[PDB]
Amino acid sequence: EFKAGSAKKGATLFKTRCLQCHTVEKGGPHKVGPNLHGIFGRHSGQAEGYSYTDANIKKNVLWDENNMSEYLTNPAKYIPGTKMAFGGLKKEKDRNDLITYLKKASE
């Protein structure tokens, strides 16, 4: 259950845990994983110009703060077969902080 946290702390988490694989700016490149602009309020597997695993598309989840928190804890548990699956963001406070940042940065 997402609770708004610190966008400042979330930005640092994004830099150290996500940026190696993702950009978030509008128009940013799909460097490894997809650019994340517009991710909230959108179905999984829909970024224009990115070939996802079929698994990520067929999960058929419409992203919100709560299901993204579950996903980020362990992506392969939520979407079996997802590619380049990172290790997960384990602490609830860290997920809350990251999602607080990502909601802003991705809009």
Binding residues for heme c: 18, 21-22, 84
- Smallest gap, in angstroms, from Cβ of residue 16 to ligand HEC? 9
Question: Residue 10 has which token pair?
Answer: 């979330």
CB of 1 to ligand HEC, least distance (A): 18
CB of 19 to ligand HEC, least distance (A): 8
Q: Which residues make up the interface to ligand HEC (CB under 6 A)?
A: 17-18, 20-22, 32-34, 36, 39, 44-47, 52-53, 55-56, 68, 72, 82-84, 86, 89, 98, 102
| Closest to ligand HEC by CB, 3 or 95 | 95
Judged by beta carbon, residue 5 or residue 45, the one nearer ligand HEC is: 45
CA atoms of 67 and 20, how far apart (whole Å): 22
Q: Which residues are annotated as a binding site?
A: 18, 21-22, 84
CA–CA separation, 42 vs 27, rounded Å?
16
